[PDB]
Amino acid sequence: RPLSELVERGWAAALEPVADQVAHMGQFLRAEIAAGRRYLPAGSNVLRAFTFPFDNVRVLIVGQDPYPTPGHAVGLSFSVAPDVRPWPRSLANIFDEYTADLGYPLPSNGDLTPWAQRGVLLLNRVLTVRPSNPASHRGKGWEAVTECAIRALAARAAPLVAILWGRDASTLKPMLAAGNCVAIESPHPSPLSASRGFFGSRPFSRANELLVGMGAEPIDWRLP
Ligand SMILES: NC1=NC(=O)NC(=O)C1
Ligand SMILES: [Cl-]
């Protein structure tokens, strides 16, 4: 199916340079199934981050690979379905920072869809994984797709704040360099850094200070 059927209109235009590579990745996933290997998230969720409007993205959160445990990955980085419990460790850590940074009560569930609906792009650099095999689809072709996405956001006239929660943070920074109104949060602790740099990093409040300083609306980070 063409991009226009898979992703939101603005994203379909932004991702046109990787249209053939996206189709190629569809073929890779089919071949995995044919080879007797599984992948996560579900096929219908692989491109889910790009189903919210490109034009309203104001914050980019970048992870590395999807959750490797069956029933966790849902196509938005770090998110889980609202009936998943206990939360994965990374997400529990994210929520302990959420409460500290913002002063909001602990969320009821792990669904980050409200962030996506408000202009937060919950991107992983690699969009699929073989279950129980962490980082197993590294180098299989997603990187050109997600790089295209990142560079497209940075080329927009609009403000953008980037939060780098993956191992490749240092490879990602240059992709964000050309954007005139792009601010990248540094340093780059990841959720599992926990009290050795992640807690107290204030990613949500800092994003909003930066957006407001650039004349953009803040993100409402509140979760139920
Ligand atoms: N634990 C996780 N690490 C990531 O980098 N991304 C995810 O979606 C989940
Ligand atoms: Cl985790």
UniProtKB/Swiss-Prot annotation:
Its main location: cytoplasm. The active site is at D65 (proton acceptor). It catalyses: Hydrolyzes single-stranded DNA or mismatched double-stranded DNA and polynucleotides, releasing free uracil. Pfam families: UDG. It comes from the Bacteria. The keyword Hydrolase applies. It is found in: Cytoplasm. Gene3D superfamilies: Uracil-DNA glycosylase-like domain. Its EC number is 3.2.2.27. One of its GO terms (cellular component) is cytoplasm. GO terms for biological process: base-excision repair; base-excision repair, AP site formation via deaminated base removal. Keywords: Cytoplasm, DNA damage, DNA repair, Hydrolase. GO terms for molecular function: uracil DNA N-glycosylase activity. Disulfide bonds: none annotated. InterPro entries: UDG_fam1, Ura-DNA_Glyclase_AS, Uracil-DNA_glycosylase-like, Uracil-DNA_glycosylase-like_sf. PANTHER family: URACIL-DNA GLYCOSYLASE. NCBIfam families: PRK05254.1-1, PRK05254.1-5, ung. Belongs to the uracil-DNA glycosylase (UDG) superfamily. UNG family. Excises uracil residues from the DNA which can arise as a result of misincorporation of dUMP residues by DNA polymerase or due to deamination of cytosine. This is Uracil-DNA glycosylase.
